[PDB]
């Protein structure tokens, strides 16, 4: 008679999941786990319901200096991350330079609210022309103007007295102070805006000893202006003051920002826009909401985010070869 | 992390 | 694979087996069916989940890039930043891919080992009382009823009871 | 090795075997010779070539150094460049050497596994009809002619034909 | 483990075994005791020491951090230094931990393989003359004295001497 | 009769050592090797019986410049490593700045004995007031003083002649030359200390062309002084000389250090103290004497030291699973 | 009768190839693959039949500035890579400095043909002495001379008028413009070469505002000259011009190079010479033509090259243990 | 990459 | 490095 039979073997199911090994690839398996995510919404979102600071076509310089076109940001709320275009076009309206701009942006990567306070009022300029510092390269509404947070002081009558102003951080939070120097094309322009021909700017703090002198040269009409405007910045510790003393080519700090919230943030070089959303992970290419430990979207991420690998397929085999 | 193989049959470890 | 069990002397899988990865198929006078060895399947479930989570936790400490800017006279340090943040990414992507490949090959052969172990286990309990067909099955010289079947499965095969019976039944096979 | 086959119960290799890594040696009344199991040898060839190319492709994404210069006041950043370009080189050289060591140990034991699998395969086809000498050979109770030999090799050993004959021949060995 | 020997059909360890990792336990008419297979134990000792030293030497080429200072306007390059010296530390700590995990799993299964190899070796020397109980032991049909025991151990089991005796003794077990 | 029995199996001992694997963790093993060290003495020690340079609460600047409080180090022997606190308080006594301080410390990481030689004697100042350069911000013994290795030259009578001094490295070892510039608050202070109102400092070497000019600004009384003191340094190759030419605000190099031993050293940012010991490995948290290849104390080590990993447990399994 | 016998076993051949594993090393194998290359020709070669720019004992500065000894390169063709010695001796002939030299070399790493165009002709100097700017530290043929691509302008009669020259990149390729400043030892030398005692140099572009002033100091006769020559450079975008305005100590840009080919190149610090060859991989120690994926020659390679590892042996085992 | 083992006998994969 | 297993019984390799 045919005998009873015990047999030994394994399980097979309808899984078309394939996994790769060192010797064999595309091995069909009973159970597998994809460990890599490849899905993004394609739009900037809140992070912990905290809105991003979408600078749009404006730059960090124009936003902090007060470019007439960046007036949309005159008052910004708390942000999780700034979004700045690669080549923002609302930048220095008056051609010039920002001393250690990239460093200032690296410090901005660690802030999460700035409060703008008028350090020196624009009406505090009795000996000098305050509202005469407007230019055609900085248009606010098809008429002329300048950076809002800074004042382009100009001689009164035909006399530009020595400015000797001082501000003490009575505030317990550190302050961000920003000033500037106009570098004109000829000595006639010099004496026209600032009577005194030889001019100097003296900025002094506990860690600052600054003796600037305008550089007059035949430069070119960038933005229609051959003159330049070099901008400088520094951080004021509490119980600490900044002293300005200048006789010409002085761009006076009107507004200054305090570091009220020093959290964690980034500068996202992305051309996307706010999409009325909130996610736990944000990339320059979109937002990710994946429990998978890995991702392949963008190496620069913000928030609770997966790890980034430059791979296209990552699946772990959890079962055995399928029939 | 629990992949849940053969559900209602085995106690997949890890939570 | 390394143990010759899956895709080897057991050339196929059981779609009818549903409650486990490894198990047995019986075919006695009373019926034929599939049962699953719950012990080996669980042990494998536990080991596999632990392997995945360990891999994930080891990967969790992985370099994370930060964005920085360098002017047109900081080209050398910009190149340094670029090459380093990408070299860490290269090293880490390799690490992940290679680990996946290796640990998968080892998971597959772990399943192979489990199947071969269970096969050898019952080959050792079923002694001269059973003929080894080679396809992954054993033919009982003495007829093994459902309870007798589970005895083989659960590991409580009281050989001596069927020892005399299957010895007498082997006598006839020995004399034709 | 791990499977006890190469350097184990098969203590030596066959220089006369020329067409394959794994195979059989027959010695019947008509002649003695070496044949090669083409299936297992190919499977091994395929797996080994695929392993090498995979290793090479995984290694292909490897950090590449670039030369830069730093003046006598850029000593700190020069040290940074030096340490990083060398640390990537350290990490990558380790990765390569370690991977070579590991994947070699695994290739060797893959060959071991293949030999043991083929040995078990024919041990399972040659049943009570063959005595297992232990040195890696089997002695046929019933004389197996060349065609009968290839039947063992190619996996088409019609046991029942020689079953009765080798059972009668085992009867004499059982009675001296 | 992968070979089913440790924690498998040999469910426990011998605290009385003292001179080796692997070995045998005899229980004849004259006495019962533990002996250790010195060959397999040494081979394992050698392989394990070589594995540890190789791992250590491969780890010896590992990134070493140096301290540097950057002023309050060198924040970007300070961040670069920090992230790189820590990313090398991350990569290297992972490498060490992962290698430890992998090479341990492989050491444990190496011991498993050695035990299973020795078991199969004596299963192959003890032929029809011994009954395989399954728990890791063999029962000699013909009584094997101490010298006969060592013959099994040292690999010089002259089967033919006990072949006739254990065949006659199997005759009685075959007829009850 | 019951038959004789040969059995196969393995060894088990009293080892409670547990090792972890990829699938299973806390696996009891017969034999294991811990490869990680976690023990440190908690104190700074000699390295090859060579004492550390424990700067205590002094800084590298104050030690090299000769801060009146750092006089304990007026003569230092060979060291294996400097130990500097995170915020040493015996620093610039007179508020100022050290040009490329961090670079100078990076070069100090490669030195192992400095010899201080008087380059220009303080009595070599016949035309100028040598021992009048003392200040209240630099107190040596509850009276006033200045940096010892540098001279605060001051006008004699009411005349500050042009200083034109020169020193040639007749020494085969390189020299470390350090000078400075006082930046005063007003032109009255200028003419008070240095009659000449417009002042310059001219330092010249084969690789140096230095034209310094004092910067006068309304700075603040840091350490009770609104004036600043900027310090500069350079290395003099043998067969090579430095030329100084100044008419005011010149801090003259008196002492200079030679690099007599250029070995291997470090700057340990640690608050520990010397504990009368000697070890082969030193960390900021203590000293290690371990044959184990790995350690988890501090990423910055000096001497024959193990490798550092940020792990808590590292044990290699050398035996098999224990019963 | 002795029975027929089927046996199982493996292959062994004459291979002496040995491979290493984690537990066992020097394991003889039937088949192995060496994956590491250790062979180099020891000579510089073409890359895609494109000749290298072997600067010989000349430097990048002397080549671009026109050192009288580097005249061999007055006209260079397209190159795959520059070869520069560690210490080229045909360098600044007149002692001085190159502003941001290493950065300029980093930019040169991305160029593959430069075209030299005379921006300002040397005969365009009617108001100044053009061919009087020769020096003994720059010998062209045992007589005196200067950098060829630059002009050492000198006063005519006893009058040095204000130079106000301007050049517009009418070219669509970017331009490399290089100038310089002589820093003399005394005011007598100043007035001797440039009548005007107080001198300035004003360079202006869209991104440049440069106000240089010569620094007079008692420096030393390096190359027999105590005066120095500081050299500066900048890149001119198309549709963009550079303005020079100077009254003394001005080294005028005669020739300027255009970036006609911006491919991929390197600077090879090697002392080898051209060996009349062509290879796909070039190293500082030689050239490699190996299909093996790895190499151990030099970490810095150019062209289709293998990966570099600091290992001595790398062989993959493809077969089994040999008898 | 093809190492060509046992030539004229087996189709080494990979090209 | 010598871990010294089963002392006075086996020659642990490596010194």
Coordinates of N, CA, C and O in Angstrom, one line a residue, chain E residues 121-168:
Chain E
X121 N 30.9 13.9 10.9 CA 32.1 13.1 10.7 C 31.9 11.7 11.4 O 32.1 10.7 10.7
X122 N 31.5 11.7 12.6 CA 31.4 10.4 13.3 C 30.1 9.7 12.9 O 30.1 8.4 12.9
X123 N 29.1 10.4 12.4 CA 27.9 9.7 11.9 C 28.4 8.9 10.7 O 27.8 7.8 10.4
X124 N 29.3 9.5 9.9 CA 29.8 8.8 8.7 C 30.8 7.7 9.1 O 30.9 6.7 8.3
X125 N 31.5 7.8 10.2 CA 32.4 6.7 10.5 C 31.6 5.6 11.2 O 31.8 4.4 10.9
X126 N 30.6 5.9 12.0 CA 29.7 4.9 12.7 C 28.6 4.6 11.7 O 27.6 5.3 11.8
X127 N 28.7 3.6 10.8 CA 27.7 3.3 9.9 C 26.3 2.7 9.8 O 25.3 3.4 9.4
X128 N 26.2 1.4 10.2 CA 24.9 0.7 10.2 C 25.2 0.1 11.5 O 24.4 -0.5 12.2
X129 N 26.5 0.3 12.0 CA 26.9 -0.3 13.3 C 26.4 0.6 14.4 O 26.5 0.1 15.6
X130 N 25.9 1.7 14.1 CA 25.4 2.7 15.2 C 24.0 3.3 14.9 O 23.8 3.6 13.7
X131 N 23.2 3.4 15.9 CA 21.8 4.0 15.7 C 21.9 5.4 16.1 O 22.4 5.7 17.2
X132 N 21.3 6.3 15.3 CA 21.4 7.7 15.5 C 20.1 8.2 16.4 O 19.0 8.1 15.9
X133 N 20.4 8.5 17.6 CA 19.3 8.8 18.5 C 18.7 10.2 18.3 O 17.5 10.4 18.5
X134 N 19.4 11.1 17.7 CA 18.9 12.4 17.3 C 19.3 13.5 18.3 O 19.4 14.7 17.9
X135 N 19.5 13.2 19.6 CA 19.9 14.2 20.6 C 21.3 14.7 20.5 O 21.8 15.4 21.3
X136 N 22.0 14.2 19.4 CA 23.5 14.5 19.4 C 24.3 13.3 19.8 O 25.5 13.4 19.8
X137 N 23.7 12.1 20.0 CA 24.4 10.9 20.4 C 24.2 9.8 19.4 O 23.3 9.8 18.6
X138 N 25.1 8.8 19.5 CA 24.9 7.6 18.8 C 25.1 6.4 19.7 O 25.8 6.4 20.6
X139 N 24.2 5.4 19.4 CA 24.2 4.1 20.3 C 24.9 3.0 19.5 O 24.4 2.7 18.4
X140 N 26.0 2.5 20.0 CA 26.8 1.5 19.3 C 26.0 0.1 19.4 O 25.8 -0.3 20.5
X141 N 25.7 -0.4 18.3 CA 25.1 -1.8 18.3 C 26.1 -2.8 18.9 O 25.8 -3.6 19.7
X142 N 27.4 -2.7 18.4 CA 28.4 -3.5 19.0 C 29.1 -2.6 20.1 O 29.4 -1.5 19.9
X143 N 29.3 -3.2 21.3 CA 29.8 -2.5 22.4 C 31.2 -1.9 22.1 O 32.0 -2.7 21.7
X144 N 31.5 -0.6 22.3 CA 32.8 0.0 21.9 C 33.5 0.4 23.2 O 33.0 1.2 23.9
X145 N 34.6 -0.3 23.5 CA 35.5 -0.1 24.6 C 36.2 1.2 24.5 O 36.3 1.8 23.5
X146 N 36.8 1.6 25.6 CA 37.6 2.8 25.6 C 38.5 3.1 24.4 O 38.5 4.2 23.9
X147 N 39.3 2.1 24.1 CA 40.2 2.2 22.9 C 39.3 2.3 21.7 O 39.6 3.2 20.9
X148 N 38.3 1.5 21.6 CA 37.3 1.6 20.5 C 36.7 3.0 20.5 O 36.5 3.5 19.4
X149 N 36.5 3.5 21.6 CA 35.9 4.9 21.7 C 36.9 5.9 21.1 O 36.5 6.6 20.1
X150 N 38.1 6.0 21.6 CA 39.1 6.9 21.1 C 39.3 6.7 19.6 O 39.5 7.6 18.8
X151 N 39.2 5.4 19.1 CA 39.2 5.2 17.6 C 38.2 6.0 17.0 O 38.5 6.7 16.0
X152 N 37.0 6.1 17.5 CA 36.0 7.0 16.9 C 36.5 8.4 17.0 O 36.4 9.2 16.1
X153 N 37.0 8.8 18.2 CA 37.4 10.2 18.4 C 38.5 10.5 17.5 O 38.3 11.4 16.6
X154 N 39.6 9.9 17.6 CA 40.8 10.2 16.8 C 40.7 10.0 15.3 O 41.6 10.3 14.5
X155 N 39.5 9.4 14.9 CA 39.3 9.2 13.5 C 39.9 7.9 12.9 O 39.9 7.8 11.7
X156 N 40.3 7.0 13.7 CA 40.8 5.7 13.3 C 39.9 4.5 13.6 O 40.3 3.5 14.1
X157 N 38.6 4.7 13.4 CA 37.6 3.7 13.7 C 37.7 2.6 12.6 O 37.3 2.7 11.5
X158 N 38.3 1.5 13.0 CA 38.4 0.3 12.1 C 37.1 -0.4 12.1 O 36.8 -1.4 12.8
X159 N 36.2 0.2 11.3 CA 34.8 -0.4 11.1 C 34.8 -1.9 10.9 O 34.1 -2.6 11.6
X160 N 35.6 -2.4 9.9 CA 35.4 -3.8 9.5 C 35.5 -4.8 10.7 O 34.8 -5.8 10.7
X161 N 36.3 -4.5 11.7 CA 36.4 -5.4 12.9 C 35.1 -5.5 13.6 O 34.6 -6.6 13.8
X162 N 34.5 -4.4 13.9 CA 33.1 -4.4 14.5 C 32.0 -4.5 13.5 O 30.9 -4.6 13.8
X163 N 32.4 -4.5 12.2 CA 31.3 -4.6 11.1 C 30.5 -5.9 11.3 O 29.3 -5.9 11.4
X164 N 31.2 -7.1 11.3 CA 30.5 -8.3 11.4 C 29.8 -8.4 12.7 O 28.6 -8.9 12.8
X165 N 30.4 -8.0 13.8 CA 29.8 -8.1 15.2 C 28.5 -7.3 15.2 O 27.5 -7.8 15.7
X166 N 28.6 -6.0 14.8 CA 27.4 -5.2 14.8 C 26.4 -5.6 13.8 O 25.2 -5.3 14.0
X167 N 26.8 -6.2 12.7 CA 25.8 -6.8 11.8 C 25.0 -7.9 12.4 O 23.8 -8.0 12.3
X168 N 25.7 -8.8 13.1 CA 25.0 -9.9 13.8 C 24.2 -9.3 14.9 O 23.1 -9.8 15.2

